Structures are given as structure tokens and as C-alpha cells.
Design a binder for this molecule. Structure first.
Ligand code: BR
Ligand code: BR
Ligand code: BR
Ligand code: BR
Ligand code: BR
Ligand code: BR
Ligand code: BR
Ligand code: BR
Ligand code: BR
Ligand code: BR
Ligand code: BR
Ligand code: BR
Ligand code: BR
Ligand code: BR
Ligand code: BR
Ligand code: BR
Ligand code: BR
Ligand code: BR
Ligand code: BR
Ligand code: BR
Ligand code: BR
Ligand code: BR
Ligand code: BR
Ligand code: BR
Lengths: 244, 249, 244
């Protein structure tokens, strides 16, 4: 039996909507430090890891050392799509049911029977390049480019970040630097890699739950997107590089 | 001459559009009191009533009362785009049926639509004689949240009174829904005469409230113990849109 | 060559219509203006564009440069801009065109220049029986309404009114006259009536955003002419053959 209240229910709902792009089913792993969601997509290209610390919630109470709450992303998202502008959200549970309660205009409560979901967790990593930027800057650029191709090319040059889509009779390019103000910080070697555009584009909904993000990549190593949530929360997405 | 002019094409189309959630074969009744249309779903569960009194009408000329039988399936697309808040709407009888005239004050466009229609004898407007012990006022937006919530969870909606609260339930298996409405959260008004409880078709409630989206005025909802639900809204420009929902059992 | 235009939105409205009409087209950059003349894929209508250098923030064009492009592809590029941000079109090499969408971030597109074969259309002057000037928004509404019930837009001209009509299973008529105030100007010679393809008229409705008013010209057995006089000296003309 647990209970967690999110004041910004809308933003929380966009995190789960993002997870829903990669997973059909998942487990909320609930402990005294907060709630964790991990999973690998069917194509096995993306591993995702979301952690919402207890302090991320307005109220947080647990009865077990470790509670595992399996859910179907479509079903949880159908409910979360019912969220109103200024709703707070309370996630609560027992043995059989997961309850989502919206509060604000009036009080509305949905119950989903738990389902049994097989657990997850795979392989700490060194990256030769790290960038820091506003999530909205990232989201805007990736939405724009996502219609232009199937592969996103990323490379660094003298602490500058480049997003590239190589098309037919066209090539699209964006320069990200501290100088042009698009990056907050960028540091590391000159490296180059490419990733599936669909996977990267799926993370752009995190703009509604995150103001700041971190970007890590290297040659033939994953693209790591860390979306910083309040109170030390994060939404991590590791995307495998396309074969070279 | 059978002729009416309504001040706001957009409000008027909201009426036509509500009635359309029941049928596309509309019967307009031009009576001595104004115009009304009333239609029921095939199972007789949902009733839609458009009632526009002659006093809220900017022009009115009904020499002999008549009903007019229109298929608006194809013209409602035109009516939808031509209906502006700045436009007035005229409905006049022709030899072949009806003519709808929209005069856009902003674009200066005059849209005239001719519709073939059967003429009939004017039917009568009767509503159920029931006392609905429970009353509340809210807006369209609240009702549409509720409708979307319940239809997601199940096919039956149970509404009841729980001591100064209205309680709404749905789901008939694992997945459930519960909502509470109370004064100022979000009820504009609430009147609980005697404890009452009833169940209705979730689909029908959704079709009833889906039409109210074009009306911003306060919406009144009334029900009783195993009795029909009445949903009532007055358009800003005049006239009432009313839905009656038959109870289950 | 290099040009900078500050409202990529106006360009987007033009290319949108163009992309609904034909696959490839040529933007001809000359000393005084950018020109575009294109016959739709079926050869029943003519779109003409003139953009005087006066409306461009920067205009470095010393001789005729021909920008040949895929209309659908250029449409994708112009959509990466949302609000009032600028577009740069440049070219050092005749085989290559650089498009820059300038805003929060600079989006750079490197486009291969296309060798579109053109037919140097004759500067014909046409005699119209009527010219009516009505609001562009009004025109769009009338066309939208009539198109829901017919493929045959009947246009009718009198000394005091122009009418846009559907005749068939659903009779609809939209009037712009003296007394409705919908008629801004009228040049009357002769009573006119003709029918034009609703499909092709729908293709160019984005043009109604370029100006407050559209000058409509036609006659019996004459083609339909839509003239959009934009507030910068810009000129867009659409000429459409009678139906069938
Ligand atoms: Br989902
Ligand atoms: Br339970
Ligand atoms: Br797990
Ligand atoms: Br790592
Ligand atoms: Br490294
Ligand atoms: Br891949
Ligand atoms: Br989004
Ligand atoms: Br990997
Ligand atoms: Br009567
Ligand atoms: Br009334
Ligand atoms: Br409609
Ligand atoms: Br207008
Ligand atoms: Br009685
Ligand atoms: Br509706
Ligand atoms: Br209203
Ligand atoms: Br030249
Ligand atoms: Br010129
Ligand atoms: Br329209
Ligand atoms: Br004129
Ligand atoms: Br004709
Ligand atoms: Br348009
Ligand atoms: Br010009
Ligand atoms: Br022309
Ligand atoms: Br044709």
C-alpha cells in the first residue's frame, strides 16, 4: 500500500506518455526513496530509466520495503489523458488495484487492476562528450528534424554540437553552441555518431515535465538523454548507435 | 409565409448540431409560440429538444403552423462553416421545402441554402411529468469531462446523492470510476431534496452533453430515484437545448 | 546570390498552393524581383508570383538565378518555421542552394538545385467581362461552403453583385453585393456566368492569406482570375480554365 501526490499532474502525465512510446507494460518500483520505472523497447535499441524521488511528490507514504505495481501503458495513459490543466494527482495502491485520483475542479478517481509484468534492468559508462541545454531547445529542434529523415547524425567539433539529417537533394543542419546561446555548457572531444530518429523524437514530450537536460554520446556508444525533473528526478533514455 | 430570423447563426447551429447527435432527419415545428424540434433515439432512451420561443426571435411570421421534414446530413457541413457569431440566420418556407439564409456582418457574405423538405402537420411539445428531487448547475465543460471519463471505464453511469455531494460511478468489472461534485467544487448550485440514485446509458449521456459544447451558459442537470435525467441549457441568444435520458430500470 | 525575407509565413502560403498544384517549380531571382510562373500538373491553371526586392530585408541578386525545387520538399522546409522568423536563401554554386531558417536556433538546409524545364509563358493580356473585389476571407468561406456539395463552382456576375454557387442536389449561393457591403469594388462590362473546378480552387485557398481582398475576374467562356495584391508590392495571380 503506497500513496504519492504529484501537484503538477499534467507534467507527470507526459513522462508516462513518453514511456508509452517505448513500452507496452512496465512496473512502478516503489520504495521509501521514491518511484522508479525501467524498461527496454521491443526493438532492443532503447533502454529507459525514470526516477521520481519521494521529494518530487507533495506527499509520499509506503507500507512495504519494495512494492512492484505492473501496468499497461495504454491503460495508464488513457486515464492520464483525462488530466485537467490544474489537477493534482494521487497514485495509490493496494494488493489488487492501482488508483489514479485527479483533484482540482472536482475529484475524479480511476482504478486499474494490477497485472503481472516481468521485471527489467540491463548493464556505468564513460562518455567523451557532454552537453547541457534547455529541454525546449532540444524538443523544438528534434520535432523539426524528425520529419526530414530516419537517421539523426550527431557530431562535436571544438565543443560545438551538430545535429544533421542527410536527405535526397538536401541536408539539414543545426549548430549548438554556448556562443549562439543554444547550449548552457558543452565539453569534450570531437566525436561522431548516428541514431534512430524515431527513438530520439519520442522523448520530445519530456519538454512538459523537464526544463533542463543533459546530452551524452560518443563514437559507437549510446546517446544518453537525461531530462532533469524537479527535486533530483530524472528521465534517462539510452539509445543504441546505428551500425557504423 | 412561414419565416423566422434568429440573431446568432452560431448559437442556432449549436441547436441543429445537438439534435444531429440523435438524427439527421430533423423536423422543425413552426408553431404559434415559436419553433421547436424534438427527436428520440431508436431505443427511445435519449430525447433531444430544441425550443426557441418567438420573443427571443428578431423576426417571426407564421401565418399557419407547419412542420418541415429536413435531411440536414449534407447541408450541415455548410451551415457549420457559414455560421458566425456575427451572422444572423433566416429560415423561410418555399414551395419545395425550406431556405436557410445566413448574412455575415463581417465578410458581407449572404449564404442561401435551398433544401427540399416535406411539409406536415405541426406536432406537439410534451415533456415528462415527473418530480426530479435532485438539482445541480454546472457548465458544459464539467459534463464533458465526466462523459469522457465514464465512457472510457464502462457503458453504464450511476449517479447518486451522498450527503451534500453528487456521486458518479462507472465500470462493471475491474476498472472503476468515481467522481464527486459539490457546491463550489465545481457546482454553481446544488439542491438535494431527498436522497436519490439512478443509472443511465454512458453512451447516451455522452451524446447528450457533446451537443452542449456550443453553449457557454450554465447547464442544469436534474434527476430522481430511478427516474429520467434532464439536462437543460439556455443559449445566450435565447432558446433552450434540453435532453431527457431514460433510466435503466 | 543572397536574399533575406523576414516573414517565411508569406512564402509558406504561396508554396503551399504551389505544392498542391505541381511537383517542381522555379523561383527566378532577378535584379528587381523574384518571379514564379507555373502550370499545374494537368495544364488547366496558371500560378504567377512577383515579389519586388523592396519587400526583402537583404537582396543581393546581380543577375538571374534560377532556383529549381521540389515543391513538396520546399514545403517541408518552410514548415520548420512557426512564427515571425526570417528565411535566408543563398547560393555561391549554381548546383547548390543554402536555406537558413533564422530564429531561436538557425536551421540550415543545403539543397541540390534542380534543372526544371520551363516554357517561358507568353505575357498575354486578357479581357474580362467582370472584375469583382471581395474580402479574401469571404472568398475562402464561399469556396469552402460550395465545395462540400459540388465539384462545380458556378461564378455569376452582375452590375451590383458577384455570386459563388453550387447547382445540383444541394443548391447553395453565396452573394457579395452593394447592400451586404461585401463588394469592395466592381468593374462591369457584361453579365457573366461560368463554372470552374472546386478541386483546383481548393488547392489555392492558402493564397487568401496574402491580402485582405481578392480581385475576381471572369466571363462567359473566359477563365477565372484571382488577383492577390499584397501590402509590399507583392503580386500573386491564379488563372483557372473553365471546367471540363
Ligand atoms: Br501508451
Ligand atoms: Br480494490
Ligand atoms: Br521492472
Ligand atoms: Br551511464
Ligand atoms: Br570516454
Ligand atoms: Br536503430
Ligand atoms: Br509535447
Ligand atoms: Br549500446
Ligand atoms: Br401551433
Ligand atoms: Br423557451
Ligand atoms: Br458539421
Ligand atoms: Br472578411
Ligand atoms: Br398534466
Ligand atoms: Br457534437
Ligand atoms: Br450559451
Ligand atoms: Br536579372
Ligand atoms: Br518588380
Ligand atoms: Br471554411
Ligand atoms: Br474590382
Ligand atoms: Br455555368
Ligand atoms: Br488555407
Ligand atoms: Br509586384
Ligand atoms: Br494571369
Ligand atoms: Br477542370
Amino acid at each position: 500500500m503506497m500513496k504519492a501526490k504529484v501537484i503538477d499532474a499534467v507534467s507527470f502525465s507526459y513522462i508516462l506518455r513518453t514511456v508509452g512510446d517505448f513500452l507496452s507494460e512496465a512496473n512502478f518500483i516503489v520504495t521509501k526513496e521514491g518511484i522508479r520505472v525501467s524498461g527496454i523497447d521491443p526493438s532492443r535499441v532503447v533502454f529507459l530509466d525514470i526516477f521520481l524521488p519521494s521529494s518530487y511528490f507533495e506527499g509520499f507514504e509506503v507500507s512495504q520495503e519494495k512494492e512492484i505495481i505492473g501496468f499497461k501503458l495504454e491503460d495508464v495513459n488513457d486515464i492520464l489523458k483525462r488530466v485537467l490543466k490544474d489537477d493534482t494527482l494521487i497514485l495509490s495502491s493496494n494488493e489488487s488495484k492501482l488508483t489514479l485520483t485527479f483533484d482540482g475542479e472536482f475529484t475524479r478517481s480511476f482504478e486499474l487492476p494490477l497485472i503481472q509484468v516481468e521485471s527489467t534492468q540491463p548493464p556505468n559508462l564513460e562518455f567523451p562528450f557532454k552537453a547541457q541545454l534547455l529541454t525546449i531547445t532540444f524538443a523544438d529542434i528534434i520535432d523539426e528534424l524528425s520529419d526530414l529523415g530516419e537517421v539523426l547524425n550527431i557530431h562535436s567539433k571544438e565543443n560545438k554540437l551538430y545535429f544533421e539529417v542527410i536527405g535526397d537533394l538536401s541536408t539539414a543542419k543545426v549548430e549548438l553552441s554556448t556562443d549562439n546561446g543554444t547550449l548552457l555548457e558543452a565539453s569534450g572531444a570531437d566525436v561522431s555518431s548516428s541514431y534512430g530518429m524515431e527513438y530520439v523524437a519520442n522523448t520530445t514530450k519530456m519538454r512538459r515535465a523537464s526544463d533542463s537536460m543533459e546530452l551524452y554520446f560518443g563514437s559507437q556508444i549510446p546517446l544518453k538523454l537525461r531530462f532533469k525533473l524537479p527535486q533530483e528526478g530524472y528521465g534517462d533514455f539510452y539509445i543504441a548507435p546505428r551500425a557504423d | 409565409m412561414v419565416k423566422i430570423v434568429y440573431p446568432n447563426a452560431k448559437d442556432f447551429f449549436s441547436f441543429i448540431n445537438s439534435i444531429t447527435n440523435v438524427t439527421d432527419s430533423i423536423i422543425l415545428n413552426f408553431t404559434e409560440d415559436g419553433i421547436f424540434s424534438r427527436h428520440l433515439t431508436e431505443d427511445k432512451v435519449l430525447m433531444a429538444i430544441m425550443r426557441i420561443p418567438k420573443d427571443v426571435l428578431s423576426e417571426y411570421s407564421i401565418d399557419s403552423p407547419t412542420s418541415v421534414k429536413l435531411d440536414v446530413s449534407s447541408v450541415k457541413k455548410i451551415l457549420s462553416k457559414a455560421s458566425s457569431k456575427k451572422a444572423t440566420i433566416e429560415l423561410t418556407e418555399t414551395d419545395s421545402g425550406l431556405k436557410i439564409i445566413i448574412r455575415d456582418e463581417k465578410s458581407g457574405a449572404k449564404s442561401t441554402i435551398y433544401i427540399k423538405a416535406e411539409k406536415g402537420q405541426v406536432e406537439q411539445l410534451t415533456e415528462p411529468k415527473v418530480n426530479l428531487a435532485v438539482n445541480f448547475t454546472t457548465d458544459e465543460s464539467v459534463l464533458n469531462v465526466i462523459a469522457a471519463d465514464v465512457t472510457l471505464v464502462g457503458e453504464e453511469m450511476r449517479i447518486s446523492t451522498e450527503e451534500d455531494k453528487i456521486k458518479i460511478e462507472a465500470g462493471e468489472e475491474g476498472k472503476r470510476y468515481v467522481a464527486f461534485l459539490m457546491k463550489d467544487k465545481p457546482l454553481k448550485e446544488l439542491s438535494i431534496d431527498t436522497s436519490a440514485s439512478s443509472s443511465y446509458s454512458a453512451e447516451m449521456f455522452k451524446d447528450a452533453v457533446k451537443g452542449l459544447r456550443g453553449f457557454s451558459a450554465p447547464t442544469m442537470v436534474s434527476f430522481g430515484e430511478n427516474l429520467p435525467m434532464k439536462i437543460d441549457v439556455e443559449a445566450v441568444s435565447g432558446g433552450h437545448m434540453i435532453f431527457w435520458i431514460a433510466p435503466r430500470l | 546570390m543572397k536574399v533575406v525575407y523576414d516573414d517565411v509565413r508569406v512564402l509558406k502560403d504561396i508554396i503551399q498552393a504551389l505544392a498542391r498544384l505541381v511537383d517542381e517549380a522555379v523561383l527566378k531571382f532577378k535584379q528587381d524581383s523574384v518571379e514564379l510562373v507555373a502550370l499545374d500538373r494537368a495544364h488547366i491553371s496558371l500560378i504567377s508570383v512577383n515579389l519586388p526586392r523592396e519587400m526583402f530585408k537583404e537582396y543581393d541578386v546581380n543577375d538571374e538565378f534560377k532556383f529549381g525545387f521540389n515543391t513538396q520538399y520546399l514545403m517541408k522546409i518552410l514548415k520548420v518555421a512557426k512564427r515571425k522568423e526570417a528565411i535566408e536563401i543563398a547560393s555561391e554554386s549554381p548546383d547548390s542552394v543554402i536555406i537558413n531558417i533564422i530564429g531561436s536556433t538557425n536551421r540550415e538546409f543545403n539543397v541540390r538545385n534542380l534543372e526544371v524545364s520551363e516554357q517561358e509563358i507568353p505575357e498575354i493580356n486578357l479581357q474580362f467581362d467582370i472584375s469583382a473585389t471581395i474580402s479574401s476571407d469571404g472568398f475562402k468561406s464561399a469556396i469552402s461552403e460550395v465545395s462540400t456539395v459540388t465539384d462545380n463552382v458556378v461564378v455569376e456576375g452582375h452590375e451590383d453583385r458577384i455570386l459563388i454557387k453550387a447547382e445540383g442536389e444541394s443548391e447553395v449561393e453565396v452573394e457579395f453585393s452593394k447592400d451586404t457591403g461585401g463588394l469592395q469594388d466592381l468593374e462591369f462590362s457584361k453579365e457573366s456566368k461560368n463554372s470552374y473546378s472546386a478541386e483546383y480552387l481548393d488547392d489555392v485557398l492558402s493564397l487568401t492569406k496574402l491580402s485582405d481582398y481578392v480581385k475576381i475576374s471572369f466571363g462567359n467562356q473566359k477563365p477565372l482570375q484571382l488577383f492577390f495584391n499584397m501590402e509590399g508590392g507583392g503580386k500573386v495571380t491564379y488563372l483557372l480554365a473553365p471546367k471540363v
